[PDB]
Amino acid sequence: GSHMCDAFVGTWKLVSSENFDDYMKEVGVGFATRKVAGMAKPNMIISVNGDVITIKSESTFKNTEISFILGQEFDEVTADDRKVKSTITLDGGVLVHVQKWDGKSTTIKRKREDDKLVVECVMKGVTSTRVYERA
Numbered sequence: 090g091s092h093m094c095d096a097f098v099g100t101w102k103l104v105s106s107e108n109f110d111d112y113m114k115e116v117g118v119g120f121a122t123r124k125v126a127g128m129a130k131p132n133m134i135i136s137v138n139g140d141v142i143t144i145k146s147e148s149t150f151k152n153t154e155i156s157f158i159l160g161q162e163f164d165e166v167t168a169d170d171r172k173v174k175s176t177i178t179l180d181g182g183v184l185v186h187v188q189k190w191d192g193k194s195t196t197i198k199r200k201r202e203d204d205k206l207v208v209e210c211v212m213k214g215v216t217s218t219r220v221y222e223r224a
C-alpha cells in the first residue's frame with residue numbers, strides 16, 4: 090500500500106467549482122469551449138498500477154486520460170487542445186501537476202481535505218478551486 094493509494098485512488102465526482110471560467114480564460118480557452126466545459130460535471134478516476142498512475146476525467150463534454158510516472162515529464166494534449174509538457178510529483182501528500190507551453194506555466198494540485206478531494210488550478214494569480222467527493 091501507499092499514501093498515494095490511500096489518499097487518491099478511486100472514483101470522484103465534482104460537487105462544486107469556483108473561478109473556473111476565469112482560470113480557463115487565463116489559460117486561453119475560447120468562449121464556446123469555456124461555456125460547455127464549465128457546465129460539465131466530471132468524474133475523476135485515479136488508479137495506480139505499479140509505478141504508473143492513471144487519471145481520467147469523464148463528462149458529457151469530453152473524456153480524457155493521462156498515465157505517467159511521478160517525476161517523469163510527458164507530452165499531454167489538454168482538454169482545451171493545448172500541447173503541453175507535463176510533470177506530476179507528490180509534494181508532501183499533494184499531487185502537483187505542472188504544465189509548460191509557449192513560455193507559460195500552470196499548476197494543478199490535488200489534495201485531500203476531510204472526505205473531499207480538492208483540485209486547485211493556478212495560472213498567473215488566478216486560482217480555481219474544484220471540490221470532488223467519492224462517487
Ligand SMILES: O=C(O)/C=C\C(=O)Nc1ccc(Br)cc1Cl
Binds near residue numbers: 123126208219
Ligand atoms: O479536472 C479538473 O477539475 C481540473 C481542471 C480542469 O478541469 N481543466 C480543464 C478542463 C476542461 C477544459 Br476545456 C479546460 C481545462 Cl483547463
Ligand SMILES: [Cl-]
Binds near residue numbers: 207
Ligand atoms: Cl489542492
